[PDB]
Design a protein around this nucleic acid. Structure first.
Lengths: 275, 115, 38, 65, 31, 88, 96
RNA sequence: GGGAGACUGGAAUUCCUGGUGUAGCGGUGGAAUGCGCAGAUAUCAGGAGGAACACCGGUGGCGAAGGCGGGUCUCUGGGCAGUAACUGACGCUGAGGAGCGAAAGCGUGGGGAGCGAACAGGAUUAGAUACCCUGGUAGUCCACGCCGUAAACGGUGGGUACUAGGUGUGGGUUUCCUUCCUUGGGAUCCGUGCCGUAGCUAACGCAUUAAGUACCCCGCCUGGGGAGUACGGCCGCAAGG
């Protein structure tokens, strides 16, 4: 849930923290942890390709099983629910009956001690993973593939879910968290339920220090630059940019999705704004 | 085309009347409206305008090979019976009469009362 | 002069109107069939 | 007036399965007949109405044919 | 009871509410 | 409310003799069990105000019965209070 | 351990001869739970009053069961998950 | 139809897609804005979504009041009748106090079909910051909290006993006509209406569900405005109470 800080200092006045109620263990699994180092927003040339990145707490990677396809018919027990610094959701540690441990993004309502099954013969309880062909229409799913074998790509953020609308032919129509309606192959696998930690969006971060801990560097508005730096820069006193708003590299606002993509045939209707 | 049997849908609202002779599969082959026969405004809510529209639609279906029709009447009563009689009088044999008026089971909110 | 107006705004409230309501002197009489309703 | 055929010593039980017993109680439009034209007591009228709704839900009776 | 008394009371109440609306910011800043 | 089985076992525990049902001890014990059941019910349905009113009525009746017991004999009142785990 | 009556509608496509065995496996949840009892009755291939899931025909089944409230909900939940079941309904054959 | 939770059904409105199909549709006292000719309205098929639950359904039921009817299941409150087994006055009222409390409104997060304050045009008008028409945002819906007011009215505080009857209707017990099917009829308990005595009232009216006859406890009134306002205080995010 959400715990609210008392206004003891000006930096804590409206601030709030996550109430880590679902966490049952404060340490990760050693055999599933990989090193992770910050890039600073810089690519292979050493150039800043993404602004406002750098700093922030050190973190380690937990290997998430986004490709649950080999343990079909093998049951798992939820051993622990842990905190993951690399994503907004929490992760659940599974104990497979054959003696293998894995990580999955914890769905909503999953508890320690639950039983998680996978495959075409699994139930439709939260946490189970089966191909979309075996999932009835109208249910709520998450961690969906895009191609049959590529691993889960859609509906992975905290509190997010996908609604399975209907299947026709080899395609199942889905409603994305964005509201967009899309078609995907039925062979693609998905997990039943919503993603947990749904209240994490309501966190008031309070001070600049917390965002600096999270690895965000300060953002300078383009209107307070010089015209050599930003198209909006220049002018005596405050100004509105003196032109229609544009990116720091001069591109105007508007649609940026490339026309005639191969996936245009697989999209029923794009998301909507201002309705 | 040549459709010997057809359907006639009559929609009589409080200020208009629309007749559309329809192929039994739901396709519209000839339609006439109260404003299509030269009436406008309040004039087209009259039973006489409904009669004219019904007769016009009946002719425009008759040259299409429609001889026998069944009527699906609908809407608040303004010129429904006059429309039926004008359908029969224009050389069309009217077999069966069914009143299909959409009756909600208490669903949407109606507009506020006028004063 | 206010009581004399007699334009539309002056007589819009007196128009019998009230479909099947507010029986007035000039309200349209109900059409009656020859046979009893039963 | 009329007779509450369900308060009698031969009053058959009311079910949502026996379709004919309910068909005798709905009008030709599929609407539930009123209590006065039927004559049964208030408890039996409620039983009839609940049975009719249940039967409609399992597609045993039309939803207003 | 005559609705005249209700009318007098309602005119008083309406005028007071109008006065309260007209001086909201002034009252907030003075108190 | 309580079924017959819990009523009988509670009455057998707290009844003054093997027949009484209206003794203040029996009434208070039954009210206590009913109140605990209602409390656990209201823990789940926080917005069931109508049942909460009945809970208040039961609490008042038990308070009155305990008042009567204390005014009649303080020893019985102390014994009942300690046996049922009540404060006052 | 309350008595229930469970009426299901199965789609008409499947063979009527496989309905009786297939239900019996479904009621294994109530049988194994707490020592419960069923009386399965079948009267199928009856036309519906209205279209249900693109179907005008339907196979009606009536199950009389005496189980725990938790058990019957579990049976009901599985039945709706199965695609061969068009609709289902649970009644309490008690005074309710 | 007492309350809470979960799941779920059908009609209709709206929108989207695709057929048929043309030149109007819509709206009014009468019109115009508006929609349509880029193919509208109409008609058929499919799809998405939200909200409210026709007939049953009433001066009928339940709840302390506010209020409560699509279906099913789970959990739960009260009431009535009979037996009278049990306790043996344990009752009543209740200053302050606590809780609940329509609608509107407020906060945070969702949702948004229809309706729709504000706001836009059109019309009417001498003028229309309105009535009417076309659009239409908050809001109405859900979750979790605030608010604490209503013609929150039966304009009738709670408890108890007594004082002609007649007639409907809801729930339950029982004797006698007896087919025992039948509102057969009676008796009795608990509700809910109508008419009417005695009595009361300024009158209207009330009248065994009292506004009659009495006893116990509480709240409130003391000419009309100023004024349920100012000042102070308490409560509330604010509106405000």
């Amino acid at each position: 849930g959400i715990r609210k800080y008392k206004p003891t200092t000006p930096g804590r006045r409206g601030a709030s923290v996550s109430d880590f109620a679902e966490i049952t263990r404060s340490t990760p699994e050693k055999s599933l942890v990989r090193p992770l180092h910050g890039k600073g927003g810089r690519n292979a040339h050493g150039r800043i390709t993404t602004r406002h990145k750098g700093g922030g707490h050190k973190r380690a990677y937990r290997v998430i099983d986004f490709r649950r396809h080999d343990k079909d018919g093998v049951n798992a027990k939820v051993a622990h629910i842990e905190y993951d610094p690399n994503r907004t959701a929490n992760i659940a540690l599974l104990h497979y009956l054959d003696g293998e441990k894995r990580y999955i993004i914890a769905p909503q309502g999953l508890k320690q001690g639950d039983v998680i099954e996978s495959g075409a013969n699994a139930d439709i309880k939260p946490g189970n993973n089966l191909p979309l062909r075996n999932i009835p229409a109208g249910t709520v799913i998450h961690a969906v593939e895009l191609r049959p074998g590529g691993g889960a790509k859609l509906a992975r953020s905290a509190g997010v879910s996908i609604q399975l609308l209907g299947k026709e032919g080899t395609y199942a129509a889905l409603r994305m968290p964005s509201g967009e309606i899309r078609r995907v192959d039925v062979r693609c696998r998905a997990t039943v339920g919503e993603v947990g930690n749904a209240e994490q969006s309501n966190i008031n971060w309070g001070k600049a220090g917390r965002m600096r801990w999270k690895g965000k560097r300060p953002t300078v508005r383009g209107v307070v630059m010089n015209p050599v730096d930003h198209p909006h820069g220049g002018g005596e006193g405050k100004t509105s940019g003196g032109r229609h708003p544009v990116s720091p590299w001069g591109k105007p606002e508007g649609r940026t999705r490339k026309p005639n993509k191969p996936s245009d045939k697989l999209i029923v209707r794009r998301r909507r704004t201002g309705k | 085309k040549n459709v010997p049997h057809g359907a006639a849908h009559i929609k009589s609202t409080f200020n208009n009347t629309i007749v559309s002779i329809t192929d039994p599969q739901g396709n519209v082959i000839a339609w006439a409206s109260s404003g299509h026969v030269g009436f406008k405004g309040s004039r087209k809510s009259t039973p006489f305008a409904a009669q004219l529209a019904a007769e016009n639609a009946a002719r425009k279906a008759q040259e299409h090979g429609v001889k026998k029709v069944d009527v699906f009447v609908k809407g608040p009563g303004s010129g429904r019976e006059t429309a039926i009689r004008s359908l029969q009088a224009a050389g069309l044999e009217v077999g069966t009469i069914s009143d299909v008026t959409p009756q909600p089971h208490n669903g949407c909110r109606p507009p506020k009362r006028r004063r | 002069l206010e009581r004399i107006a007699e334009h539309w705004e002056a007589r819009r409230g007196g128009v019998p109107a009230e479909a099947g309501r507010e029986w007035r002197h000039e309200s349209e009489p109900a059409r009656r069939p020859g046979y009893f309703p039963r | 007036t009329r007779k509450c055929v369900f308060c009698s010593k031969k009053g058959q039980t009311i079910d949502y399965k026996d379709t004919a017993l309910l068909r005798t109680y709905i009008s030709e439009r599929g609407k539930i007949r009123a209590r006065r034209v039927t004559g049964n007591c208030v408890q039996h009228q409620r039983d009839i109405a609940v049975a009719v709704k249940n039967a409609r839900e399992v597609a045993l009776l039309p939803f207003g044919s | 009871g005559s609705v005249i008394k209700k009318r007098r009371k309602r005119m008083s109440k309406k005028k007071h509410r109008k006065l309260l609306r007209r001086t909201r910011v002034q009252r907030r800043k003075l108190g | 409310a309580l079924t017959a089985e819990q009523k009988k076992e509670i009455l057998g525990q707290y009844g003054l003799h093997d027949t009484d049902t209206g003794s203040p001890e029996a009434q208070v014990a039954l009210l206590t069990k009913r109140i605990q059941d209602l409390t656990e019910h209201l823990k789940v349905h926080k917005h069931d105000h109508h049942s909460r009113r009945g809970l208040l009525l039961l609490v008042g009746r038990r308070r009155r019965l305990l008042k009567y017991v204390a005014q009649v004999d303080v020893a019985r009142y102390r014994s009942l209070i300690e046996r049922l785990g009540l404060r006052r | 351990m309350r008595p229930y009556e469970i009426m299901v509608i199965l789609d008409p496509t499947l063979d009527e001869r496989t309905v009786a065995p297939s239900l019996e496996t479904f009621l294994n949840v109530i049988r194994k739970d707490g020592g419960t009892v069923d009386k399965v009755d079948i009267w199928g291939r009856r036309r519906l009053a209205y279209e249900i899931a693109k179907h005008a025909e339907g196979i009606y089944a009536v199950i009389d069961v005496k189980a725990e409230p938790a058990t019957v909900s579990e049976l009901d939940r599985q039945l709706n998950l199965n695609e061969s079941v068009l609709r289902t309904k649970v009644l309490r054959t008690d005074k309710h």
